[PDB]
Design a protein around this nucleic acid. Structure first.
Ligand SMILES: [K+]
Ligand SMILES: [K+]
Ligand SMILES: [K+]
Ligand SMILES: [K+]
Ligand SMILES: [Mg+2]
Ligand SMILES: [Mg+2]
Ligand SMILES: [Mg+2]
Ligand SMILES: [Mg+2]
Ligand SMILES: [Mg+2]
Ligand SMILES: [Mg+2]
Ligand SMILES: [Mg+2]
Ligand SMILES: [Mg+2]
Ligand SMILES: [Mg+2]
Ligand SMILES: [Mg+2]
Lengths: 291, 95, 110, 147, 55
RNA sequence: CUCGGAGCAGAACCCAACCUCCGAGCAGUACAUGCUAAGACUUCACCAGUCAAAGCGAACUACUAUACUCAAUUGAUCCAAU
RNA sequence: CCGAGCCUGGUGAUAGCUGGUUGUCCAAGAUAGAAUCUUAGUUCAACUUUAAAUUUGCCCACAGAACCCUCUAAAUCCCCUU
């Protein structure tokens, strides 16, 4: 109110702003220190003789000859194989509900890794051995939303909070290559490469995704009901029947395990300049992008 | 230490620190005890008990180990089922 | 950034509440961030100095200092130590009062 | 739509139909509607939250008659003046887990009372001096001279 | 520094694979002790299998 | 040339000399000298070293037993053997 | 100037060693020790400097801190008040 105009009506009487009368904000440019004069000249802060003044100090970690500290400690595999471990950026239910209340993520359509990135909900670093997001249980009590979310990992309590409100949660695997394409599709459509089919999870991760308790995308659909009922009895909530809901057709929607996006089969070449999609007809190519 | 490499022009990491120490995101460094596998037949159970314990390092040590490593080893990681996940953050710490 | 959709009941499950309409007729004004949250942040330097910052302050910023010193003194038992920057329109306070100030600024409808 | 060899229909051909994983089975040990649940902060700063569960024991008809009598003796210290059985739990932050613990205590009460366990379990150390105290309180007891 | 005693390795007879090292006099028969085996959580017989070093 | 006790250094701690004296580089008994864990001392740094309630599990109704006697009675990292 | 020639180059060789290190003004500021092919050096600690946070710091009253033993020492440690 007053302060805004006070700084502009006071500028009307002052001289014109020009390249001469400019200055930096005080406190933003420290004075430079030069080895000149009585105070900073002579020895110039280096001391008297030794290796100190001559600039020949030993390397960092050298303790004068006795076995250094970083060498007399034994070796242990704290970081053995750190570059081959899988990482998952956590997504809390508080964060998800916060993104939904602001319109940055719409619950009317299926929520996947792409929609989260497009809404700045998460930041995936595939080059840093990231394999996706893990749905954590923080904020489960206040969470109130009916969504169809796909997350690479999910805890038993986070699932119950989403299945209590009438939603569906599924766990799917994206390899490092597909994970970079799902997060940033546009930079991939500028490479003129056909959409590749994502690979299956390694041997060690097949049990996780072939199990219904984890809502796996390669699990038997006939075992989900019994598993959905267990959490209801355990955590004391009445399992709702989504078949009656109007959004049921959207909740069931799931992508083929060999699929990357929704409605875009592997093998096609998106042409953004002309807004067209190219499909191969070769009998051999079709069999490669379908198996 | 190599402050400026001859090919990339950037600081290098001392790999003798990575094979012995673990850094928690908070800034703490964890190590083993020197001699937890040497001459256990002449040592007491009490001494052997505190020899196989993972202990912390001090300010002077941790400041050195941070200079001997690059920023890649100070980032926040989200490993799956990490045994040290709860130790990467301090609680009820003042001053 | 999309504008937040209208909701029937406020505050939302996440606790977000839209600004009051019309704006309060006060000497100052604190506008929301581009993400539609209150601009109250926690800052720390030297590992031991805890501060709180109020950004995006328009109008007379010295009246806001008086209102804050009158609202935080009971909680502390003494006048808080603050810093005013007329240039940047920012209020800096010694101590963590993040959640306490966010709610106090919502009652006014900022 | 798109189909691949690894599709669910192909992998599990005996589970066709979209409405195959969302069918609530119709074939119920604890009914929630017959339970009174409360949530309240504990010692609040204490991080954990408290979830109280209470329900009238006698009126409740979803428990076997003999079990109710067997439960009103063992867990008689958890019953109030009105007759309700109270079960608290504050071992977690999330109201979900705290309620799950209370519900599982009920399933454990209905099993102990139905198992009819009469095995000679180990005696507690705190109860060993009361056994001596009671034993020595019986030898001080006397009989009337002329009964 | 005459090596009067030696360090031996006592192996459990329960098949758990648990073993411990003890000190015994050189001029003496192989030991058969009754040590605690943490695997089975009770005392079990042990027997000298092989010598480690000469004390 | 490392380690321990005494004097110098009389009374908390600390204190040197190619100063004055005596010693150590083991042995013996156990075979729960098993596991775990609050709180503390510390040879003036670090490394190393030291004492420990409660608890699990044992033992036990006698053994000043529940961290053996003993002053020092000793050797980091890499590596090798397994 | 042959205990092994000269020239160029690698080469701005290396030097814990000596020497040198360029305007004004103000301010704070003298340091137990350990390890080290280490004592002409270095690293840790200690002292010293700057910024920040917080609450105690210095001086010190009684009471209290060992027998064995030759100087039955000057003193110290601990410590509210002030
Ligand atoms: K000077
Ligand atoms: K000078
Ligand atoms: K000279
Ligand atoms: K030197
Ligand atoms: Mg000089
Ligand atoms: Mg010198
Ligand atoms: Mg900051
Ligand atoms: Mg010390
Ligand atoms: Mg004990
Ligand atoms: Mg030179
Ligand atoms: Mg001065
Ligand atoms: Mg040497
Ligand atoms: Mg020196
Ligand atoms: Mg005092």
């Amino acid at each position: 109110q007053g302060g805004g105009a006070r700084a502009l009506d006071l500028l009307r009487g002052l001289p014109r702003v020009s390249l001469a009368n400019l200055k930096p904000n005080p406190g933003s440019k420290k004075p430079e220190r030069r080895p000149r004069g009585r105070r900073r000249g002579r020895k110039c802060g280096r001391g008297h003789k030794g290796e100190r003044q001559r600039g020949t100090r030993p390397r960092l970690g050298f303790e004068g000859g006795q076995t250094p500290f970083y060498i007399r400690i034994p070796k242990y595999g704290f970081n053995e194989g750190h570059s081959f471990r899988r990482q998952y950026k956590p997504l809390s239910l508080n964060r998800l509900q916060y993104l939904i209340d602001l319109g940055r993520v719409d619950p009317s359509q299926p929520i996947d890794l792409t929609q989260l990135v497009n809404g700045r909900g998460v930041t995936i670093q595939p080059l840093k051995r990231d394999y996706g997001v893990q749905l954590v249980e923080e904020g489960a009590d206040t969470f109130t939303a009916k969504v169809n979310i796909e997350v690479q990992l999910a805890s038993e309590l986070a699932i119950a909070a989403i299945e209590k409100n009438g939603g569906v949660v599924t766990t799917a695997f994206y390899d490092p290559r597909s994970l970079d394409i799902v997060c940033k599709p546009v930079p991939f459509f500028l490479r003129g490469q056909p959409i590749p089919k994502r690979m299956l999870p390694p041997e060690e991760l097949v049990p996780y995704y072939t199990d219904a308790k984890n809502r796996g995308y390669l699990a038997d659909p006939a075992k989900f009901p019994e598993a959905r009922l267990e959490l209801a009895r355990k955590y004391g909530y009445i399992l709702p029947d989504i078949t009656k809901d109007e959004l049921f057709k959207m909740l069931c929607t799931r992508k083929d395990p060999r699929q990357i996006f929704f409605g875009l089969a592997p093998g096609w070449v998106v042409n953004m300049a002309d807004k067209k999609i190219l499909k191969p007809t070769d009998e051999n190519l079709l069999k490669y992008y379908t198996s | 230490l190599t402050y400026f490499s001859a090919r990339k022009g950037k600081r290098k990491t001392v790999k003798a620190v990575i094979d012995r120490f673990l850094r928690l995101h908070c800034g703490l460094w964890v190590r083993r005890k020197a001699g937890y596998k040497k001459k256990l037949w002449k040592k007491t159970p009490a001494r052997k008990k505190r020899l196989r314990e993972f202990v912390f390092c001090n300010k002077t040590q941790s400041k050195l180990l941070d200079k001997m490593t690059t920023s890649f080893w100070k980032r926040r990681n989200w490993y799956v089922d990490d045994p040290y996940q709860k130790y990467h953050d301090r609680t009820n710490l003042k001053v | 950034i999309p504008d937040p959709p209208k909701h029937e009941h406020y505050p939302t499950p996440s606790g977000w509440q839209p600004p009051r309409d019309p704006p309060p007729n006060l000497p100052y004004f604190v506008r929301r961030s581009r993400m539609h949250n209150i601009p109250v942040y926690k800052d720390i330097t030297h590992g031991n100095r805890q501060m709180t910052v109020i950004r995006k302050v328009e109008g007379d910023i010295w009246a806001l200092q008086k209102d804050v010193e009158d609202f935080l003194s009971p909680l502390l038992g003494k006048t808080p130590v603050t810093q005013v920057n007329e240039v940047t329109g920012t209020l800096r306070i010694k101590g963590y009062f993040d959640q306490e100030l966010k709610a106090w600024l919502l009652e006014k409808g900022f | 739509e798109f189909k691949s060899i690894y599709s669910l229909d192909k992998l599990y051909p005996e589970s066709q139909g979209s409405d195959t994983a969302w069918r609530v089975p119709n074939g119920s040990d604890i009914p929630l509607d017959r339970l009174t649940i409360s949530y309240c902060r504990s010692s609040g700063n204490k991080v954990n939250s408290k979830a109280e569960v209470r329900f009238h024991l006698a009126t409740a008809e979803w428990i076997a008659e003999p079990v109710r009598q067997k439960i009103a003796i063992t867990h008689k210290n958890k019953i109030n003046r009105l007759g309700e059985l109270i079960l608290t739990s504050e071992s977690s932050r999330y109201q979900f887990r705290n309620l799950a613990d209370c519900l599982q205590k009920i399933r454990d009460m209905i099993t102990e009372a139905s198992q009819t366990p009469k095995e000679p379990t180990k005696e507690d150390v705190k109860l060993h001096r009361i056994r001596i105290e009671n034993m020595n309180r019986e030898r001080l007891r006397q009989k009337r001279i002329h009964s | 520094s005459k090596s009067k005693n030696i360090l031996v390795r006592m192996v459990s007879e329960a098949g758990t694979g648990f073993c411990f090292n003890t000190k015994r006099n050189r001029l003496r028969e192989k030991l058969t002790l009754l040590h605690y085996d943490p695997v089975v959580k009770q005392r079990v017989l042990f027997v000298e299998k092989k010598k480690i070093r000469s004390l």
